């Protein structure tokens, strides 16, 4: 019962964007901060440009293109869109520049100046992003603070669609094949049976919120991933973070229930966190909260990709 996917995949010429600086590098390739300048449009768009190494396997290219396929098909304010791809000797993926980086890194770097209003807003925005993916019948399969990016301190987006799977309109579970997997973010059913669902994404949401609430701590730190599934069967979960009222923590705990259907729906998580976003000091207890404030390069013609629509 699926509608046709009429998303446009935009093919970019290399002459249309200029790389400025190197954000990061890898065997896979190097990511560049740059500007995209669409031909004859008098606009400059801050972008991140992923250029793969020429030493790339056809298995590797195949995987990245499926990621682009997913990224091109999504249109939501809390999900990263693929602007386009460039088919050069080495393939280049173009996405919206997220200047403040990884949300995991941001909370670690700024743990001193982050108040309860920001934390709850982020939980709301991530829930919306996931709720949207759920609407598109998508299962992310890798939700975690490392895969949320910061456009600005006030705006965050879900990213890393490498493990994402579309669900047949009929089907409710995706059954995986063996791979390297983010054990400590995974629903039990995923770990035991390689079963994934929107509810298994809810589990990971739960862990992702805990990362934020503990300003970037490592879940189940010092305990081997090989022992995680038994601990979960024993009924142990991550501990209540110091700043958390029982209200918030109760919500995380619900995400980690063994019966996936007993976990909350993303639309419910939206509701409950935004209720708390209204009176943040009531729900997160942070020292000197009411005092904290959170916020490089021809910027005349510069436009954010969020305002560049086609």
């Amino acid at each position: 019962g699926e509608a046709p996917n009429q998303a446009l995949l935009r093919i970019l010429k290399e002459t249309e964007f200029k790389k400025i600086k190197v954000l990061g590098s890898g065997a896979f390739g190097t990511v560049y901060k740059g500007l995209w300048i669409p031909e004859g449009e008098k606009v400059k768009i801050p972008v991140a440009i992923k250029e793969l190494r020429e030493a790339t396997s056809p298995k590797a290219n195949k995987e990245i293109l499926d990621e682009a396929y997913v990224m091109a098909s999504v249109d939501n304010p809390h999900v990263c869109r693929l602007l386009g791809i460039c088919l050069t000797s080495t393939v280049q993926l173009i996405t919206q520049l997220m200047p403040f980086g990884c949300l995991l890194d941001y909370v670690r770097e700024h743990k001193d100046n982050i108040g309860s209003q920001y934390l709850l807003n982020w939980c709301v925005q991530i829930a919306k992003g996931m709720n949207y993916l759920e609407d598109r019948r998508l299962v992310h399969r890798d939700l975690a603070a490392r895969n949320v990016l910061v456009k600005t301190p006030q705006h965050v987006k879900i990213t890393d669609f490498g493990r994402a799977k579309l669900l047949g309109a009929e089907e409710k579970e995706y059954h995986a094949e063996g791979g390297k997997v983010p054990i400590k973010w995974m629903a039990l059913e995923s770990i035991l049976h390689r079963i994934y669902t929107h509810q298994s994404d809810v589990w990971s949401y739960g862990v992702t919120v805990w990362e934020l609430m503990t300003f970037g701590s490592k879940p189940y730190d010092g305990i081997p991933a090989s022992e995680i599934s038994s601990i979960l069967e024993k009924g142990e979960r991550l501990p209540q973070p110091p700043i958390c009222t029982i209200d918030v923590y109760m919500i995380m705990v619900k995400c980690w229930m063994i019966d996936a259907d007993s976990r909350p729906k993303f639309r419910e998580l939206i509701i409950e966190f935004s209720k708390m976003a209204r009176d943040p000091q009531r729900y997160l207890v942070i020292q000197g909260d009411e005092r904290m404030h959170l916020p490089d390069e021809d910027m005349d013609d510069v436009v954010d990709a969020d305002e560049y629509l086609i």
């Binding site: 997997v181 054990i183 973010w185 991933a225």
Partner: peptide
């Protein structure tokens, strides 16, 4: 220090 493990 690896998030992803085989299994």
């Amino acid at each position: 220090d690896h998030q992803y493990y085989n299994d």
